[PDB]
Amino acid sequence: RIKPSDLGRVVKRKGQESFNFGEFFAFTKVCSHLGCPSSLYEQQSYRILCPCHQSQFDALHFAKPIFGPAARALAQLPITIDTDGYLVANGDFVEPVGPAFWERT
Amino acid sequence: MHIEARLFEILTAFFALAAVVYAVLTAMFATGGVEWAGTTALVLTTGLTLITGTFFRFVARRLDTRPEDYEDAEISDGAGELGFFAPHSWWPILISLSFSTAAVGAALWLPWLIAAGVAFVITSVCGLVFEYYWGPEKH
Amino acid sequence: WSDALALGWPTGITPEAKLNRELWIGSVIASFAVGAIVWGLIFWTSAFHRKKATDTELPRQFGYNMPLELTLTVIPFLIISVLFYFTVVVQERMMHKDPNPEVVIDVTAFQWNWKFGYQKIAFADGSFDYDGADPERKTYLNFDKIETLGTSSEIPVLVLPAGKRIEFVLNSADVIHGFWVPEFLFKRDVLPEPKANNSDNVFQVSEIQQTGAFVGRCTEMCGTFHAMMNFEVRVVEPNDFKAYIDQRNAGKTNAEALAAINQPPLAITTEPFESR
Amino acid sequence: SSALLRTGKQLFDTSCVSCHGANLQGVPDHGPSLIGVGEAAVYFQVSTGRMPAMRGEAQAPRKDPIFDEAQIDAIGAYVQANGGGPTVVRNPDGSIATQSLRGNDLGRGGDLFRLNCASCHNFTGKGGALSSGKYAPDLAPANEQQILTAMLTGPQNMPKFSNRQLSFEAKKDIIAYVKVATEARQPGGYLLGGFGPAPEGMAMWIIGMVAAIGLALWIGARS
Amino acid sequence: ALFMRTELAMPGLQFLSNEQFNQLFTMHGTVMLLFYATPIVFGFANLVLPLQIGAPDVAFPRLNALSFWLFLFGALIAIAGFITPGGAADFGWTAYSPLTDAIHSPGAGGDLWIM
Amino acid sequence: ALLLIFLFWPWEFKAADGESDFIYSLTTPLYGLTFGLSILSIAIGAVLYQKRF
Amino acid sequence: LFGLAADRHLGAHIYDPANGGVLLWQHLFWFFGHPEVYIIALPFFGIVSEIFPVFSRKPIFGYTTLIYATLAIAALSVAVWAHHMYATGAVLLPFFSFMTFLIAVPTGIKFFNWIGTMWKGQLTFETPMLFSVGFLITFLLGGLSGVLLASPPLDFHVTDSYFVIAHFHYVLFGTIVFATYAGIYFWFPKMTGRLLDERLGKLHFWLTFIGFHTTFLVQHWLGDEGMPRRYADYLPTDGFTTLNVISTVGAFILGVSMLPFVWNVFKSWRYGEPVTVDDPWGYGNSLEWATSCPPPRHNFTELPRIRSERPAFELHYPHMVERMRAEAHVG
Amino acid sequence: VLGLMGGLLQINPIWNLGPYKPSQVSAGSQPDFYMMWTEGLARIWPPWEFYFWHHTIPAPVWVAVIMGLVFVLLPAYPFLEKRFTGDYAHHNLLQRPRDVPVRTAIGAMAIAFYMVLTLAAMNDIIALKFHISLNATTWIGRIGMVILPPFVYFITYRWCIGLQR
Numbered sequence A: 001r002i003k004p005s006d007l008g009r010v011v012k013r014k015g016q017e018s019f020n021f022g023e024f025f026a027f028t029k030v031c032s033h034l035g036c037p038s039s040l041y042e043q044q045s046y047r048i049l050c051p052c053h054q055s056q057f058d059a060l061h062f063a064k065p066i067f068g069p070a071a072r073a074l075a076q077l078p079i080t081i082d083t084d085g086y087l088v089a090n091g092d093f094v095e096p097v098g099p100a101f102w103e104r105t
Numbered sequence B: 001m002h003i004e005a006r007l008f009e010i011l012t013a014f015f016a017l018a019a020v021v022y023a024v025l026t027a028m029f030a031t032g033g034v035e036w037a038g039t040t041a042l043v044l045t046t047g048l049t050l051i052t053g054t055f056f057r058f059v060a061r062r063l064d065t066r067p068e069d070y071e072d073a074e075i076s077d078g079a080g081e082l083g084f085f086a087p088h089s090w091w092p093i094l095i096s097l098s099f100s101t102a103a104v105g106a107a108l109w110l111p112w113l114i115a116a117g118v119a120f121v122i123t124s125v126c127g128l129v130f131e132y133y134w135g136p137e138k139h
Numbered sequence C: 001w002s003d004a005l006a007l008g009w010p011t012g013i014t015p016e017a018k019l020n021r022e023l024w025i026g027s028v029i030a031s032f033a034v035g036a037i038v039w040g041l042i043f044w045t046s047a048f049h050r051k052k053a054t055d056t057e058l059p060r061q062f063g064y065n066m067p068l069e070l071t072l073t074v075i076p077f078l079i080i081s082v083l084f085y086f087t088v089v090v091q092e093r094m095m096h097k098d099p100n101p102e103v104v105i106d107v108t109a110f111q112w113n114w115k116f117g118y119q120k121i122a123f124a125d126g127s128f129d130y131d132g133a134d135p136e137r138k139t140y141l142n143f144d145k146i147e148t149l150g151t152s153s154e155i156p157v158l159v160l161p162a163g164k165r166i167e168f169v170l171n172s173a174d175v176i177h178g179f180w181v182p183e184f185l186f187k188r189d190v191l192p193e194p195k196a197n198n199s200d201n202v203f204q205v206s207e208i209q210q211t212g213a214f215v216g217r218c219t220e221m222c223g224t225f226h227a228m229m230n231f232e233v234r235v236v237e238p239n240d241f242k243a244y245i246d247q248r249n250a251g252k253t254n255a256e257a258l259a260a261i262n263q264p265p266l267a268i269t270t271e272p273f274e275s276r
Numbered sequence D: 001s002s003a004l005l006r007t008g009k010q011l012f013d014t015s016c017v018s019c020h021g022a023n024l025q026g027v028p029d030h031g032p033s034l035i036g037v038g039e040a041a042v043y044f045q046v047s048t049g050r051m052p053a054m055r056g057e058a059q060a061p062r063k064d065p066i067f068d069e070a071q072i073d074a075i076g077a078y079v080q081a082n083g084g085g086p087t088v089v090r091n092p093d094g095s096i097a098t099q100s101l102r103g104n105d106l107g108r109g110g111d112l113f114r115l116n117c118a119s120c121h122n123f124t125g126k127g128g129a130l131s132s133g134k135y136a137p138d139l140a141p142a143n144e145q146q147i148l149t150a151m152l153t154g155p156q157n158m159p160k161f162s163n164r165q166l167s168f169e170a171k172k173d174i175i176a177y178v179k180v181a182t183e184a185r186q187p188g189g190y191l192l193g194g195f196g197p198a199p200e201g202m203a204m205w206i207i208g209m210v211a212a213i214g215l216a217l218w219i220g221a222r223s
Numbered sequence E: 001a002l003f004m005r006t007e008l009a010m011p012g013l014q015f016l017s018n019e020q021f022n023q024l025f026t027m028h029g030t031v032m033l034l035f036y037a038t039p040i041v042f043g044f045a046n047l048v049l050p051l052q053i054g055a056p057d058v059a060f061p062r063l064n065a066l067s068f069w070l071f072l073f074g075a076l077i078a079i080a081g082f083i084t085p086g087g088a089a090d091f092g093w094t095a096y097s098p099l100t101d102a103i104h105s106p107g108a109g110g111d112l113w114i115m
Numbered sequence F: 001a002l003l004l005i006f007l008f009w010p011w012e013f014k015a016a017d018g019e020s021d022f023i024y025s026l027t028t029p030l031y032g033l034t035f036g037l038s039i040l041s042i043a044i045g046a047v048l049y050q051k052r053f
Numbered sequence G: 001l002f003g004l005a006a007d008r009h010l011g012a013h014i015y016d017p018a019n020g021g022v023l024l025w026q027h028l029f030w031f032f033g034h035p036e037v038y039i040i041a042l043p044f045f046g047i048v049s050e051i052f053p054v055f056s057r058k059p060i061f062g063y064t065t066l067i068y069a070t071l072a073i074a075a076l077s078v079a080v081w082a083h084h085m086y087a088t089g090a091v092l093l094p095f096f097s098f099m100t101f102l103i104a105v106p107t108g109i110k111f112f113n114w115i116g117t118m119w120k121g122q123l124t125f126e127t128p129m130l131f132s133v134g135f136l137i138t139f140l141l142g143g144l145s146g147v148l149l150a151s152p153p154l155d156f157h158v159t160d161s162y163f164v165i166a167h168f169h170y171v172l173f174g175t176i177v178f179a180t181y182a183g184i185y186f187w188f189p190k191m192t193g194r195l196l197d198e199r200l201g202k203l204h205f206w207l208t209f210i211g212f213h214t215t216f217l218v219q220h221w222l223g224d225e226g227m228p229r230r231y232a233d234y235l236p237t238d239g240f241t242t243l244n245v246i247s248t249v250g251a252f253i254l255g256v257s258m259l260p261f262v263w264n265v266f267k268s269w270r271y272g273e274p275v276t277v278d279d280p281w282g283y284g285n286s287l288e289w290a291t292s293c294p295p296p297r298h299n300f301t302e303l304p305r306i307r308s309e310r311p312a313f314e315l316h317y318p319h320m321v322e323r324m325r326a327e328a329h330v331g
Numbered sequence H: 001v002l003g004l005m006g007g008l009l010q011i012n013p014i015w016n017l018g019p020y021k022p023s024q025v026s027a028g029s030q031p032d033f034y035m036m037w038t039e040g041l042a043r044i045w046p047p048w049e050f051y052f053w054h055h056t057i058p059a060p061v062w063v064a065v066i067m068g069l070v071f072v073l074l075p076a077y078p079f080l081e082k083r084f085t086g087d088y089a090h091h092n093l094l095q096r097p098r099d100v101p102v103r104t105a106i107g108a109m110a111i112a113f114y115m116v117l118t119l120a121a122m123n124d125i126i127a128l129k130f131h132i133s134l135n136a137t138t139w140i141g142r143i144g145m146v147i148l149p150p151f152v153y154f155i156t157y158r159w160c161i162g163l164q165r
């Protein structure tokens, strides 16, 4: 959940302009380098840190990596609410999740 | 040695005078009485010079004239065999490394580093002290 | 001619400041005379005796001149004794602390700003008596009723009358600060607990002749924003000061109480720091 | 005498206004607003000593506290009177509570700690390093109310866990797990700091190998 | 010192900060007084004192090397506060009374300074 | 001593915060301290015998 | 320092202002810190007093007088520590003020003995002599400013300002920097067997002198009007914005002045005119100019007979002892 | 010795950890000290990937080939040295390491490389205990990996010749 104060520094990757519901963004938690949980989230730098080899993704710039051997952004999930007020998924990831291989991401 | 003792006696006399004068001048005329922090330093620097001067005085009274203390002398007087002056040794740098390890372990509060530094200091000092006394190996 | 020999000392606004300036000028002239003499000696011995000329055997091996050394060791003792006597006189004068003052300010210095107190106003005229002490202290600090408190956006301005005995009581909340007004030609350190450390945090000013605005700095090491603790001093007429005080007694800021006596509300010698 | 925050707004004015403003407005150079925050934020920030802060950089470190004799209450009440932030828990005496918040359940508390908290601190609450300066401190010297207010107010670069996503039982159980994990023995000998194989490798190289090589030097001749 | 000067010209904070300036003058004073002058004294002593008194060596020849290495490593320890993210020591060269406490000046550069 | 310690020492897991055991936390250190020290003493005796007889 | 570390790592209540903790630290630190400046001052007095007679072709004026002046400065340096704490209002001012006035004298006799040793000789200005004369000038100005600083009613204004900075920079620079360069240019052959270049030495000296006197002279005026030390910023409405520019120009000149010295040392250590004799500066003393220019291990292959404090001079000029003993007391 | 240090020092306390679950993680994730070089090499290798037609070559491929190259260069050293020096005789007397300066320098360079790779694996512990930035340690390792081996080579060569003298 992003503070309402900023909400103007978001960059919104080319194919996922409507994947967020207000101030919720819901990125994946599997690091795009070798698959450890990227769970270290710094609340006022908006950086996600993978503790296995220390990559850093920019939560305000479609989870773009900004340090380390990580080279691909984290996948984003589309969300919304249902007719009762609960958070549901609005589809599927647009691309595979996790480490890469010969075929594709 | 007669002149070193006289130097230290002069210094001790002046330091004792200054210490007493400062103490009795701050007992009065001062805001809170005796100052208690310069007084102590002064009496104990007096004690330092007193210890050194007294040792030199005893050694001078227990000694016969020396070619250094003696004028009138020639280089054939000191002809002889001096002491033992250590040639090359590599233990000082290890002692310094150990002490620096202990110091940096005390700066950043890390007890394991302090313990390791103390152990290394003991080991290096033992190596320095025993360097010219180890005998040949027993096989 | 004397603005040069003062080496940039600002002229005083207090009698003791003027005594201090007189002593400073005298001592500067004396030291300059000594330096000129000795530099002349050096330039002479290096300009003429330099002549390792066409002819030379070896100059002369002389090394002892007992009477000359006795003379040149006896004269500096007198030269320093004169100025020691004079400085003792002046430094005794500048710290008199007469028992009965007429205005008593409580200066508190905290982390990177000031706060002034107005502890007591009692003119020798019988024209104005006031007491601002406060048991708001529910412990060495002093708390008052009329407190001008400075913030990072407004330079705290202290207002004082002209031609009255002033007394300053210096206390600090956290660390050592410095209380320097370059026009008083005087400064004193603001200690945390001045009584447990055997320092007297009280000094007086005989009178302030000129009126106007003057700047003050901190002269210690306070930490990050040491260079951003400036304040100001406004010296006004006694009746204008009385009007300021009685208009401040009715709840009003310093800016409006200053504007109500036809004076600029903000500090005119200092501006708040943008680069903070 | 709750109608007395004249103390409070006596200490703030002489220790905070240079970085937060006279009206708690957040001097646009250094400090935040401090309006929406409450008594819990002030309690955690001052009691641990991170408050009144010197120069201020990537992380204000923990230091010795300046204020007590019930003046942490004074500043807390004064700040709560200017907003609606969270408040500190109290016991039936009016003091700040303790051992009744020990989530009698340590399994659930430990699972919650490993899912939510262990990523930045540790398996057992040792420190952890963040990016570019900042780190996550050790959880050993913090008492119970400090743990609660820490995960309730969300201090610098630490996420904020509300009472809706982490209910009060969850918080009590996490507190109990932390306080038990920091005070249990090591039933295998001297633990080498709480971390993984780095102290173990160092201890091997600097104890076992030197013992073995020293005995090899003693037994065998040198030539 | 050159960094200090080039900041002190031209009013306004052009490229430094307040913290960095304080660290600069602290470390300048410390280095120039304790890591350059006091050891250069013993440098000249070790160079030309035994020659001047007509001796073959100093009294204790290994204590000499011990002194040199202690000096070098102490200096390196004290200087290595700049690689700390908080910086070096920021109080004065003189380290006045309550400013170097634990409440004020809480960084990890003062510890290295002291040791 | 190793044999006696292994036979008669309180070894079961007792950890809690009410009854601070501290006797269970010493059960493995004692095993190691007796076993290793016994066999080390035997080795040192053997080395001395080889070096001096 | 151990007390301070205990207070920082254990909360040891040693220096709290509640106790006498604020003035205790200052007393201890300054009792250390004044002997420190005299420690780094005295041996360089020795260096210059040892360089002067070699290039003046004369004996050192007042040997025993210089020894007594050194002893007096040493004895007095430990009982003046509190002239650094005038503005705290917690010390006995007349005691320390008078005793600093007292310590001002032996330095004067030392200065006069140096000037006397240079008097009516045969001067030649090679780089060591040039640096020694620079030392003389700079230290005189610094000591004048210091004795001006020693009176309490004046320190009540100029303390913690740039006047103090100018003062101790004069004394520190003039002593360590100039006497150290003199000692280097003097004893480089005796430790290497080569000779440093002289044109580069003169260029170095003049650059250093000009840059130094242009970077630190205006700071007296800059600090007399209110500008305290340890400020990172100031306002344009204040004065003193041109003096800071002059000072920074001087600082950059001083910074550029170091290239000739390191270039000279880098070139002259390997190349450079070799020395195949003892005493490359003729008319030397002190028994170090009586052994091969790079001394052997153990420093000596033979010693001369010692009768005075100029043994090498009497060794290289044996026809001079009668004239050195005859006219040694004219003055 | 093994019994003593297995009784007095604690190693791998699995109960302080938990069972493996793909959703939770901790901060110190190092292997034992003989795989730390593999981990450090994976940490300090820059993110260089190649994307061409319908395919992807990720970064850890680099770690794979470097690891394999090390494991291939270890067993094939004697043949390299005999090809380069051209000496094929029988030898039963050993050499003192100071008499062969080039091989000693090569070995010291390899040991320095290994030490850099091993220390680059405890980034978190070093940056936490000793107050250093994390990005700083990453870049220190990334640059040391290139400038420390040759410096060590130079110093070791000169040191060997000094011992000979």
Ligand code: HEA
Pocket: C031, C034, C038, C076, C079, C080, E093, E094, G037, G038, G040, G041, G083, G084, G100, G103, G104, G107, G108, G109, G111, G139, G140, G142, G143, G144, G146, G147, G149, G150, G155, G158, G159, G160, G164, G168, G171, G172, G175
């Ligand atoms: C290396 C040297 C050095 C030397 C030699 C000196 C020499 C002297 N110093 Fe200085 N001083 C410092 C380094 C030095 N100082 C430093 C580093 C500081 C402050 C640092 C800090 O605070 O951070 C300092 C600060 C300092 C202060 C306090 C500043 C303060 O207010 O904060 C004072 C005065 O009390 C002082 C006085 C003197 C005096 C009286 C001498 C006397 O020794 C000098 C006397 C010299 C003369 C050259 C006289 C020449 C003689 C003749 C020509 C006869 C002339 C006779 C008459 C005029 C009577 N020094």
Ligand code: HEA
Pocket: E001, E002, E004, E005, E025, E026, E028, E029, E032, E033, E037, E092, E093, E094, G165, G172, G173, G176, G215, G229, G230, G231, G251, G254, G255, G256, G258
């Ligand atoms: C022995 C001592 C000594 C020396 C030599 C110096 C040298 C210089 N000092 Fe320093 N100074 C002090 C001791 C010394 N100082 C002390 C004690 C203080 C106050 C301490 C404090 O307040 O805490 C102080 C404070 C101080 C200040 C003010 C700090 C403050 O604001 O209060 C200033 C500048 O105004 C200053 C300037 C200089 C300058 C311009 C030089 C010039 O002499 C130096 C010129 C030098 C060079 C430029 C080096 C050349 C460099 C290059 C060639 C760069 C090459 C780089 C690489 C190869 C790495 N000094």
Ligand SMILES: CC(C)=CCC/C(C)=C/CC/C(C)=C\CC/C(C)=C/CC/C(C)=C/CC/C(C)=C/CC/C(C)=C/CC/C(C)=C/CC/C(C)=C/CC1=C(C)C(=O)c2ccccc2C1=O
Pocket: D198, D201, D202, D205, D206, D209, H033, H037, H070, H073, H074, H077, H106, H107, H110, H111, H113, H114, H118
């Ligand atoms: C000597 C040999 C390596 C040369 C091989 C020739 C080479 C051309 C073949 C190709 C190899 C390739 C190209 C590069 C090799 C680099 C690396 C990738 C190799 C992987 C495995 C490798 C072959 C293993 C060799 C490593 C080396 C031989 C270690 C020996 C170290 C020395 C001799 C120990 C002597 C005594 C010792 C110093 C006692 C004091 C204790 C000190 C502090 C040990 C230092 C230390 C170490 C060594 C740790 O591993 C460690 C791990 C975790 C925590 C701490 C430490 C630690 O402090």
Ligand code: HEC
Pocket: C111, D011, D012, D015, D016, D018, D019, D020, D030, D031, D032, D034, D037, D041, D042, D045, D046, D051, D052, D053, D054, D056, D060, D075, D153, D154, D155, D156
């Ligand atoms: C300018 C120096 C400074 C001083 C003095 C200071 N603060 Fe702070 N304060 C900060 C900074 C900077 C932060 C930002 C939090 C952070 O980044 O760690 C902060 C944060 C806070 C917070 C938490 C803000 C939040 O959103 O959670 C509180 C509460 C607070 N301060 C209260 C105080 C109290 C109480 C005092 C003591 C009277 C005080 N401040 C004095 C600088 C200061």
Ligand code: HEC
Pocket: A040, A041, A042, D048, D050, D059, D060, D061, D062, D113, D116, D117, D118, D119, D120, D121, D130, D134, D135, D136, D137, D138, D139, D140, D141, D142, D146, D147, D150, D151, D155, D156, D157, D158, D159, D161, D174
């Ligand atoms: C890496 C993100 C992060 C997460 C996730 C996190 N912490 Fe923190 N924690 C921090 C940081 C950063 C600080 C330092 C804040 C400060 O110093 O102002 C901190 C401080 C604390 C402190 C204060 C420690 C002390 O000694 O004062 C406690 C207690 C704490 N956290 C508990 C928790 C608990 C419980 C959780 C799990 C609900 C948690 N933390 C999750 C990063 C994190």
Ligand code: FES
Pocket: A031, A032, A033, A034, A035, A036, A038, A050, A051, A052, A053, A054, A055, A068, A070
């Ligand atoms: S797995 Fe997240 S960085 Fe390699």
Ligand SMILES: [Cu+2]
Pocket: C177, C178, C218, C219, C220, C221, C222, C225, C226, C227, C229
């Ligand atoms: Cu200030």
Ligand SMILES: [Cu+2]
Pocket: G084, G085, G086, G087, G159
């Ligand atoms: Cu002072």
